[PDB]
Structures are given as structure tokens and as C-alpha cells.
């Protein structure tokens, strides 16, 4: 993430949040925890909704852009920040088993988004996709973050979808600038 | 009665304590009497990802929000009966019947309680503030998502709202037109 860049993806981010209904946050990794930081947001205009402030830290394990991330290492590399970093249970949903997390990873490779699913707080959904340099880096991850309420079963595949999209205009937009 | 800066600063510890005991959205409205509306002129949010997060100057419906019944629950059986009601969704009580039988009870429990009607998965409770005439002029309202605002937590979110508002009162009388 850079700054012309950063002004190329914030109308990405807006008509997201206009598309979704719901707040949308980009993210780059920090690479101590594996963390995501949140460095830009649009926000829906919900009276109820997801307002993680800028600078604020998604979960490695569990949140939709710490899951992400994790998803583009290797085996090895999960199994090394498991045992380093713990898996700490926010809630009831959260991943806290390898076999779990490492499935989770697994499919969110196949169906190109990652889902959190009320893992970092009871109520909150997010669907994640990460942003590619010219060395298929994950660089920044976008997400789209609201209420269980809004974010219903039957909707997740269509807002997968969406963060696809603006995850590739982004990565396109990099790629185009480099 | 008359909400400025100074006012707003001395109860603020209230709100915040509120905010605190609640771990949801504290909001202050006041009653416009000329076009009779309650606007948010202050706000505490809790620190949750998901949370109420209305706009300052923000208005929370008559009929259809826990400030707004608040404010209809002060008023006389014949000022209420005394003009389309709009329905924010299928909880929204558009039957003039129906909406009665709500500002009766909330005369009773000693506060008001919005399941939704304003705005799927969003609950919020309230009780009015008084002015040294008795008069009911502003409210204080607890806003936040049905996930945490659970029905074992109603009556006590309820009492906590009418203790709030009776120390605003108190306040208000001892600092009125500071």
C-alpha cells in the first residue's frame, strides 16, 4: 500500500460499501502477529454496524482479514505461527483447532474469500479477499464487515462475490501503476 | 428545559458510566417541541466492532425508536390519540391500538423498548429527563444489537436506563442554565 494507490482504491472501497450495504476495510499485515491493520474504511450509513476504528487489529485466526492472509501460506508456515502465536477464543466460534483452521484455510483458497463467521465477535460476519503484488505477495486484504442480521446464510456466497471484485480491481490497479 | 456544552459536560460521566455498565451505545436526545422529533445531541459509543453508531443531530423516530417512545409515553392518552405512521419494518407498530398498549406499559415498567421496530437486530431502551418544572425535555436511550441486548438482559438494561436518567434529572436541576 502506497498513496496515489491508496486514493485509487477508496472509490473501490465506496461503491463496495454502497454494493454490500455494509462497512468496508482494507488491510495490511503486520508481520510480527500476523495481525491485520486496518488503514482505510468506508462505513456504511446503519444506524447498527461494523465502526473498527482505522489502525485497529483484526485477528490473525480470526477475523475475515487475518484469515485472509493466513490462507496464502504454506502448511508449514500455519503450523509455525500456530505454535508461536496460540489461538486465542474470542467466542464460541472461533477456530482453535489447527485441523479446523487449516480446513477453513483450505477452502477459503478454493471459493476465493475468507468467512468469518461470528469468530471474533458474537453478532459481526466478514468476508475478506487479499490484494497481489508482481510477486503474488498478499499485500493489503479488503473486507466487508456488518451484522449476522444483514449478513444472512443465503447472502454470503453473493458478498463473497463482491469482495472478490474489489480485491482484483485493486490488484489490477497496482499492477497497471507499478 | 435547555441542553448546552456545559450541561452536556457535567452529566457526560453519567453517559460514560452508563456506557460502561450497559457495554452498549449511550445516546442523549431532546424533544423538538415545535416539530416534534427527538434528536441526538450527544453519545457515548462502547468500544464493540458492532455497535449503534448514529450521527450527532442524528433522529430517532416517534413511534418507532426507545427515545421517541420515551417522549410519546409522557404525553396524555388524548395527545397521543390526537399522522401515517411509517413502518421501518415488519415490528414497526403502525396501529394506532397497537402503539397505546406500548406507551401503556412503558408508563408502567418506568421505561421505553424499541425490539426492532426502528431497525432490524437493533434493540434500545429509554427513560425521559426532566427539567425543574417536571417537564420532559431530553432522553436517555441504551442502543445496541439483539446479539448482546438478550431477553435475560431487558429488565436490567431497563433499570440501569432509569437510574441514568433520574441522575440526569438530579443533575440537571442543581446546574440548570450553566
Redesign the interface.
Known amino acids: 500500500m502506497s498513496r496515489n494507490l491508496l486514493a485509487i482504491v477508496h472509490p473501490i472501497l465506496r461503491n463496495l460499501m454502497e454494493e454490500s450495504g455494509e462497512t468496508v476495510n482494507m488491510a495490511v499485515l503486520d508481520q510480527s502477529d500476523h495481525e491485520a491493520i486496518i488503514i482505510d474504511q468506508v ?1 456504511c450509513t ?7 476504528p482505522i489502525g485497529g487489529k483484526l485477528p490473525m485466526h480470526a477475523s475475515g482479514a487475518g484469515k485472509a492472509f493466513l490462507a496464502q501460506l504454506s502448511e508449514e508456515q500455519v503450523t509455525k505461527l500456530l505454535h508461536r502465536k496460540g489461538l486465542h477464543a474470542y467466542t464460541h466460534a472461533t477456530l482453535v483447532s489447527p485441523v479446523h483452521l487449516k480446513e477453513d484455510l483450505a477452502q477459503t483458497r478454493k471459493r476465493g474469500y475468507s468467512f468469518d463467521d461470528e469468530e ?5 460476519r466478514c468476508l475478506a479477499a487479499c490484494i497481489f503484488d508482481e510477486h503474488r505477495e498478499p499485500f493489503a486484504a479488503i473486507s466487508i ?6 449478513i444472512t446464510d443465503d447472502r454470503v456466497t453473493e458478498f463473497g462475490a463482491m469482495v472478490i471484485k474489489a480485491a482484483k480491481e485493486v490488484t489490477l490497479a497496482y499492477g497497471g501503476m507499478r
Open positions: 462505513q446503519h444506524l447498527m454496524r461494523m465502526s473498527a471474533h465477535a458474537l453478532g459481526l464487515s456488518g451484522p449476522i442480521s444483514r
